[PDB]
Structures are given as C-alpha cells and as structure tokens.
Prior knowledge:
heterodimer, A: mainly alpha, 1 helix, 70% helix, 0% strand, B: mainly alpha, Retinoid X Receptor, binds ligand B0X, transcription
Amino acid sequence: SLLKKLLLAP
Amino acid sequence: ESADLRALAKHLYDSYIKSFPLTKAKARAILTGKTTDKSPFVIYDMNSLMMGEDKIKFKHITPKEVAIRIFQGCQFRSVEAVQEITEYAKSIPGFVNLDLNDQVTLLKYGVHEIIYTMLASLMNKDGVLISEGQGFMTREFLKSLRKPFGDFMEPKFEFAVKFNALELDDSDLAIFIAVIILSGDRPGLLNVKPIEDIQDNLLQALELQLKLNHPESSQLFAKLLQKMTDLRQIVTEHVQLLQVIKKTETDMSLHPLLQEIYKDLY
Ligand SMILES: Cc1ccc(Oc2ccc3nc(COc4cccc(C(=O)O)c4)n(C)c3c2)c(C)n1
C-alpha cells in the first residue's frame, strides 16, 4: 500500500 | 520518572518541529501580524481567488469550477499533511518497531484526526492560512461556496474555535498528537497491547505537560481526552460529506493516497 511505502522510506 | 517524561515531551516537540513546516507559534505570529514576513495574500472572493493564482505557490506542479478547484486544493494539502504526519509518527519511540500492518492501521485511522487538530492552529474565527502562510482564505468565502461545498469546512472552523480557546502550544500539541496516533482501539489492529503500553506512557507525559504548562487549568487534561473523542466525530461528518460530494457531483479525480485511507473509514 501507499501508506506502507511511506512508512518504510527513511 | 517525571524527568524521563519531560525528556520524552521534549523529544516529541523537537520531532514535531522537524516534521511540520508551519507550527502554531509561527502561524499565530502570522495571523496576528507580529512577524517580519510579508503578509499573506487574502482570498475573500472569486476575484481575489483569481488574482491569487499568481501570488500563491503550491509544492505540487499542475500544468473546473472554483468550488471544485478549492476542494481539490484541500485534497492535495491533505496529501502533504499525511506525509508530514507519517514522518512524525515514525519519531514516536516504539512506533517503527510495531507490526508494520499495525503502523499502517494507526496512520489510516489517525491521520485525519491529526489533520484537523493541526488545521486549528492555522485557523482563527475569520479564516484559514494556506500554503505555509502564503495565503489566507476567509471563512465567509469558503462558506459562500455552492452546496455541498459551502458546508465542507464549516464543521472544522467550529471545532477550531473551541479548541483554540484551550490555548495549547506546540509543546502541548506534540504530545496530544502522539497520544491520538497511538490509539489501541483502531479497527483491525493485530497486536493491541504494545500500542496501549506506548499510549499509556504518552498519556502520562501529556498529563504532566499540562500540569506544568497550564498550572491554573486543572480540567485541561480531561477536556483534551474529550476532544480526541470529538475529533472522531468531526472525521465521521467529513467522510459522509465526502460521499455526498462524490455523488452530488459528476466525478472528479480523488488522490490515490486519500482513496486508500478512505476505504472503510467512518
Ligand atoms: C490560488 C488558490 C488558493 C487556494 C486554493 O484552494 C485551496 C488550496 C489549498 C488549501 N488548503 C486549505 C486548508 O484547509 C484544509 C486543508 C486540508 C484539509 C481540509 C479539509 O477540510 O479536509 C481543509 N484550504 C482551505 C485550501 C484551499 C486554490 C485552488 N487556488
């Protein structure tokens, strides 16, 4: 998901 | 230890400053004219909205009737806000160690409540700051927009007026936001206890922050816990107006990040 991608990016 | 709770409070405030470009302190300085910075361009009618097309800059590049352009504008601001809040959430001790799907869940159900909390900081009774303080759109002009859009933001101004009367500062707000994000009762959480334990410590931090920062207002903590419940109601009203719009109108484009958050959101 998009939210997951935002959470994973330093 | 109370010392550790103050250290946590300070960590959250410092992270909050890092994560959010326009703080309440700076927003208040603008709204009251205390700043040295150039005055916001005031959008108070269709004509001034047109004139503002030049003056005001948006971070997103975009090479429809007014009511729709404004609504889409709030969309894109909300998209920016979700990313800022995500960055803040990740600074809360313990959060990045939670199950990743639970992190997604906390954000999905938390972000709008945080958006409207922080939007208040940019609001007074007469209007709202837009684009990092570059512009100021009047409450009356937004109210004057054709239905359903004239009612889109009024619920939030009404919330902000009462919320701002509590006179929280950025230090209070950082902890207040943290508590909300770490809500163990969001739908579909898998591992509740670690979230509850984190929130319990944040709540202790908030209680001590308010006791020290607002010595003469014993009731403030209990009132803020109620405002958290209230914020969920504001979000419910918003979601329902969102469905009305999504139908009362021939379809516009909804940003996919918002589409993802909206799914199963009430
Ligand atoms: C030149 C120009 C100026 C403004 C403008 O429209 C805009 C753009 C961004 C804006 N941000 C806000 C903050 O309010 C918000 C913000 C986020 C969510 C909500 C929410 O209620 O969900 C309300 N308003 C009100 C805007 C209106 C356009 C299109 N052109």
